[PDB]
Amino acid sequence: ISSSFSFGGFTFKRTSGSSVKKEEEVLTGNLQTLKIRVHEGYEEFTMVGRRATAILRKATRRLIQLIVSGRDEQSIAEAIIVAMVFSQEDCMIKAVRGDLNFVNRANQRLNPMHQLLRHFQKDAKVLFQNWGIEPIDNVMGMIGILPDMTPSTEMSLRGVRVSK
Numbered sequence: 001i002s003s004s005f006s007f008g009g010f011t012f013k014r015t016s017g018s019s020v021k022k023e024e025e026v027l028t029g030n031l032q033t034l035k036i037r038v039h040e041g042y043e044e045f046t047m048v049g050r051r052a053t054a055i056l057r058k059a060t061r062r063l064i065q066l067i068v069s070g071r072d073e074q075s076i077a078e079a080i081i082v083a084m085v086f087s088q089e090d091c092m093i094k095a096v097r098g099d100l101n102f103v104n105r106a107n108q109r110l111n112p113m114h115q116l117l118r119h120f121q122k123d124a125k126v127l128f129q130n131w132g133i134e135p136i137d138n139v140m141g142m143i144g145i146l147p148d149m150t151p152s153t154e155m156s157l158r159g160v161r162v163s164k
């Protein structure tokens with residue numbers, strides 16, 4: 001049985017691929033240990049939000065491609081953040097600043113993936129600045145988006161393209 005799920009305000013659906021779960025202990029940009037359930041395998045997902053949608057292709061702790069469309073700069077940026085965290089990429093982990101000890105209304109500690117999400121939703125500047133950039137080749141006729149969230153016809157955040 002396949003099922004959708006919600007992460008970061010987006011409805012995710014795996015559209016192809018597979019993965020196995022493992023636990024990996026990572027050390028953040030502030031030397032905090034997080035034990036994350038890492039998915040190993042190549043997978044493709046849709047992401048559906050109120051004001052943005054995306055297709056995310058990822059492998060093991062690796063964002064391969066994010067094609068994102070949205071109504072405005074902020075909503076595009078929200079989807080990018082969520083996909084970056086969901087990738088479980090090392091560079092996202094290393095972009096963390098300070099400790100992560102977020103707890104919910106119920107005072108329940110958030111799990112590592114949600115700790116990361118809460119942190120980067122608050123401020124993504126470090127994430128975006130450290131993620132990496134690349135020239136676009138225009139083969140999809142799409143547009144780039146830069147770490148400052150401005151569009152670019154030349155370059156984009158690594159693996160990210162913005163579509164109409």
Ligand SMILES: Cn1c[n+](CCCCC(=O)O)c2nc(NCCCCC(=O)O)[nH]c(=O)c21
Pocket residue numbers: 001002003004005014019039043058086087088
């Ligand atoms: C980073 N990450 C976090 N999760 C868990 C999402 C929550 C799933 C749930 O609540 O059920 C993931 N699930 C998958 N594939 C598995 C997709 C399976 C579809 C399903 O059975 O729900 N891949 C990932 O990279 C991944």
